[PDB]
Amino acid sequence: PGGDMSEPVTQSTLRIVGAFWRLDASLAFRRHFPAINWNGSYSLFTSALDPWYRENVAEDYPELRDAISELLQREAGLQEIVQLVGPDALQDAERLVIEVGRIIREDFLQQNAYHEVDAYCSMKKAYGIMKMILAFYKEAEAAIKRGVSIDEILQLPVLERIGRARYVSEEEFPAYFEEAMKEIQGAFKALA
Amino acid sequence: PGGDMSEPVTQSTLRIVGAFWRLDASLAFRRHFPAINWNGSYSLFTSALDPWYRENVAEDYPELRDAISELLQREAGLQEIVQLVGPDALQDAERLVIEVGRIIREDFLQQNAYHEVDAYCSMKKAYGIMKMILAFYKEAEAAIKRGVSIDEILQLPVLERIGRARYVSEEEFPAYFEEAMKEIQGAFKALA
Amino acid sequence: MAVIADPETAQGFRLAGLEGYGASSAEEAQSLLETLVERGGYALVAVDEALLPDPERAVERLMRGRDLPVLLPIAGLKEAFQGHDVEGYMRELVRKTIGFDIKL
Amino acid sequence: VSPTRMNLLQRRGQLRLAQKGVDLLKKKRDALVAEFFGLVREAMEARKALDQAAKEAYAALLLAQAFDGPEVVAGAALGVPPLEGVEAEVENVWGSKVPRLKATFPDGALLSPVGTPAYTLEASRAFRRYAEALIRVANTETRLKKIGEEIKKTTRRVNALEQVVIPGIRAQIRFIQQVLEQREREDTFRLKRIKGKIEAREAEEE
Amino acid sequence: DRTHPIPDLTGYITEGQIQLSRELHRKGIYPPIDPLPSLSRLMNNGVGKGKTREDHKQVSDQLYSAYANGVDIRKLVAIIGEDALTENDRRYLQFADAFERFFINQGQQNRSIEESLQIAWALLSMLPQGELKRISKDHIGKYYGQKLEEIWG
Amino acid sequence: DRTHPIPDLTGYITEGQIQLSRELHRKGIYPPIDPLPSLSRLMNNGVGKGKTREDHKQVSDQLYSAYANGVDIRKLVAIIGEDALTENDRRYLQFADAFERFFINQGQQNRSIEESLQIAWALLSMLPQGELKRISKDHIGKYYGQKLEEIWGAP
Amino acid sequence: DRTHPIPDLTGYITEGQIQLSRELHRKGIYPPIDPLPSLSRLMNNGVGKGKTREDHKQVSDQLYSAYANGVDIRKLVAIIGEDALTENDRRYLQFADAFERFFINQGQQNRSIEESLQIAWALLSMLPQGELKRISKDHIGKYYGQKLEEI
């Protein structure tokens, strides 16, 4: 009736189903489409489906998926601090985490069903975008260890390259991802 | 039964009567009579009776009544914060709203049926008391705007006259009310 | 106003019109601070960090009922010439009052 | 507490007011922190200014006791009395009063201002400015402490609410709802019994 | 539970009720009678001039007002703490505590109506003259001022 | 009580609701419709170009957001004070007051959609350009700026 | 809801209860058993000499005391803050965290009774020898001191 999950119908359903996808109008108000809340959603099919992933999509897809999940969790666990204080006030590591959470949300979770190409994505496209994001994260963490200011990372040209991976075609994607990985390894070498 | 207003009899009555005089246990416990719950009471004959009030009571009686309704609703809104944080946490204007609310509760809505005078009140007497209260509120609000300390307004002697007006005899009332209006103008005019 | 520090600067503070007393150790400094605080008077006391970094954390047991005196950690004489991290002072102060120690 | 429908509605209204109060307290805290993070800037600027003022005053005083006899300087200092020129007024900050040292600073109250040493008299102005800086740093620091305690109090209230009050009212609401459902079930059972009674009467004895 | 059918119907039938309080019982007050939920319908027919004493009714009304204020201020302290209480609020709290300890609590003792009125007056003297809005000025002149020490100690 | 069977089932079957507020009624406002808990589920399909004006959806969204902000500031100012509020917050306060006084409280007058949208733009003119985050630039340019004197003269 | 008829009637019939906690699950702990509200009514008669070993009951009671004290201190930190905690409070909070991380979080290990007791003794050794009020001095002497070197 009013979104309360305590009712018998929803409780009986959740007892017997495997995946719960929590649509939320909050995400829609934020223009995050599809509007699925990754904190309350859950799937009981990942462990049994892992072997299929290792055999078909990539031997490391489970690892990248779990890493993305953990990174989103860390972005969520910093909410109290960003609630009490603004976003800029956070130290380098936390600010990197927030920006990477933003890029994850906007360029991997988001999908536009009215787009000619983005309406559909294969598991290899997802593996590619996730690998791009995680490689960028590792390089950025190293760079901030080296002492580069977060502003430089915020304006790195690899951001445009990784943000447009959604709008690229299925057949063209492999070369694009190879080039993006090369350019991710390169773009940090030039920076001090 | 139990004071519950959700009984079938009370609900059936709600849908047929033009006025609902809801009594309250909290007020009666405090020996505050008539003990009518203002928030949960209503009338439906007010609009249709405006011409009669203009002819037989005062040409601005409807507006004074509506002003008191406005003040009581402002008090009801502010009481949420009062419960949250307490009277001292409020600003001075809100404190004045609260104090005038108490003045209306005790000096206008309160009425003693075992008294030889206050057991009955005429329409013109009610109008005079309401005019006194509204004039005082305007004066005190202006004073707060000119910087007078709210604690100093509550000690103005005119408040005792406003509070004792109930017990003035019907025949004597007009002189008392003219004097009270004069004194209300004076009590702030002297401060300047 | 009163200040407790080394004898050399105590005479200077007295020249400034304040009250100065020689201090050279933590125990004597704390005892003198207690004497000054229990002695009703000026509302400010300046304490060097070298002898008592947190005077309030050491003598909080008295001024709770009378918070008129003010304790301010003043930079030490030796540290004054060679300097100290002022940014660190406010950083640690935020760490103390909010507990998040986040800034930049 | 009495399980009744009106009591349930009142409890739900209380819950709504509590949620609204949590939002209100959060917004007040946001205002407090917005002020605190600027008042810290003011405090740090004052602290650096005071550091510079103290450095220059100490530099000025250092040479005074070298060229001239220290004993004469001490005597001249003793000549100056320890007068009072600080007015500890109260300033209203976020509904609280704090000591503001709005010192009148009477320059003409210094008895025997003239000092026999040539440079001692000039050094007095430097220490007057240093004392003004010390007063300023104290004034900002006290208000910073006050705002810190206000933010701590507000967060105590918010946490108390969201961790003790709201769950308690939720438990009360669930209890009352359960009792009402039980009463409804008993009423349905009774109605079934009596309807069966009348039906059996008609069927058997008509 | 006052909402239970038995007390509810009885109160709808009878002419008042004296309701005990478990909170006062735990504090040791006897008779543990809470006056706010209590009531006597026919009271006005047996009190006043020529029956008990002229100040009776107004004294009872004022006692109810003050005790209700005290209970409300207790609820306010439960959420804000004593440090924030103004002087009048503390006077009302002290009145509520003294009320509970010296008017409600009497043990096994026969108090004449005159003694009871005297105690009520000594207690109301804890409040400023002007706050007694329910008691007529002449009664205030004739009975206000006596201190509680004059009765005990 | 919205949890009651009659309104809950009606909500299941019907599409939205127009909610009357007792606070507005006691404050003297007629018709006392509180926009915040009101919803029209079909509004989108019946609004826009070729039916009404082009700026209707965005104006409704901006009115909703601004009124919500204003009520929030109104609650907070009772404890922090008018001075404590920033300037944009004060703008929201005045906007909410004007919205209640001139938009919601229309008495018995018959307002065409054009007159209502004119009032809406007049109310939105109080907030600075750039705080109208939910209206396209062209719409703001074309319709922003009109003073409240257009309707304040004959409310 | 522990007051639901199913858990309530089961508790009235059974001889104890093992309870899982959502906090330990949100922390990523397996198995997420919360020791404090759990209980085994028959435990006293199935541990000790000739059944496990002589330190079992005292160690269990001491672990209960230490973890409950740590949780009480943890909820005491929601008032005065970390800076106000004393040395004993720091030790107890650290023990509670390490307890959660090692004694409860065991994944799919098939810990033996001896292994579990060794882990418990290592975790207890963080606290001072004098605070182990519930363990006989002999057992403290025999098994105290081992660090968390096994990881």
Short mmCIF file of C-alpha atoms in Angstrom, two decimals, chain F residues 30-31 35 53 55-56 59-60 62-64 66-67 94-127 132 135 143-155:
data_model
loop_
_atom_site.label_atom_id
_atom_site.label_comp_id
_atom_site.label_asym_id
_atom_site.label_seq_id
_atom_site.Cartn_x
_atom_site.Cartn_y
_atom_site.Cartn_z
CA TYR F 30 -9.56 28.72 0.39
CA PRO F 31 -9.49 26.31 -1.42
CA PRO F 35 0.22 20.61 -3.10
CA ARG F 53 1.50 25.60 -22.77
CA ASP F 55 6.25 25.29 -19.82
CA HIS F 56 3.71 23.48 -17.65
CA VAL F 59 6.73 25.09 -13.78
CA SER F 60 4.86 22.53 -11.68
CA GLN F 62 9.74 24.11 -9.74
CA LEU F 63 6.70 25.17 -7.72
CA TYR F 64 6.74 21.87 -5.83
CA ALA F 66 10.38 25.66 -4.02
CA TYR F 67 7.35 25.25 -1.77
CA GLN F 94 8.98 34.98 1.18
CA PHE F 95 8.17 32.76 -1.80
CA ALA F 96 6.31 30.24 0.34
CA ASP F 97 4.31 32.98 2.04
CA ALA F 98 3.39 34.53 -1.30
CA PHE F 99 2.56 31.11 -2.75
CA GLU F 100 0.11 30.37 0.04
CA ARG F 101 -1.36 33.87 -0.09
CA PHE F 102 -1.80 34.36 -3.85
CA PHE F 103 -1.65 30.92 -5.49
CA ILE F 104 -3.43 28.55 -3.12
CA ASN F 105 -5.80 31.20 -1.76
CA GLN F 106 -7.81 32.20 -4.82
CA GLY F 107 -11.19 32.50 -3.10
CA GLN F 108 -14.04 31.85 -5.51
CA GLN F 109 -12.30 33.19 -8.61
CA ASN F 110 -12.19 31.23 -11.86
CA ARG F 111 -8.57 31.08 -13.01
CA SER F 112 -7.83 30.02 -16.55
CA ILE F 113 -4.67 28.02 -17.09
CA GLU F 114 -2.95 31.09 -18.52
CA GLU F 115 -3.78 33.19 -15.45
CA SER F 116 -2.56 30.42 -13.15
CA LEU F 117 0.70 30.07 -15.07
CA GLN F 118 1.13 33.84 -14.94
CA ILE F 119 0.79 33.73 -11.16
CA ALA F 120 3.23 30.84 -11.04
CA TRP F 121 5.86 32.74 -13.01
CA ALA F 122 5.29 35.83 -10.88
CA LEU F 123 5.91 33.74 -7.76
CA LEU F 124 8.97 32.13 -9.34
CA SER F 125 10.39 35.53 -10.29
CA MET F 126 11.11 36.08 -6.60
CA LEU F 127 13.72 33.33 -6.61
CA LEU F 132 15.33 27.58 -11.17
CA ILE F 135 13.16 24.74 -15.79
CA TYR F 143 8.58 33.91 -19.07
CA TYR F 144 10.82 35.01 -16.17
CA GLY F 145 10.85 38.50 -14.71
CA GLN F 146 7.17 39.41 -14.56
CA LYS F 147 6.49 41.29 -11.35
CA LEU F 148 3.80 40.31 -8.85
CA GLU F 149 2.05 43.64 -9.54
CA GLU F 150 0.35 42.01 -12.55
CA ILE F 151 -1.91 39.96 -10.25
CA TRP F 152 -1.36 41.78 -6.93
CA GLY F 153 -3.37 44.70 -8.30
CA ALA F 154 -6.48 42.53 -8.70
CA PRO F 155 -5.88 39.34 -6.68
#
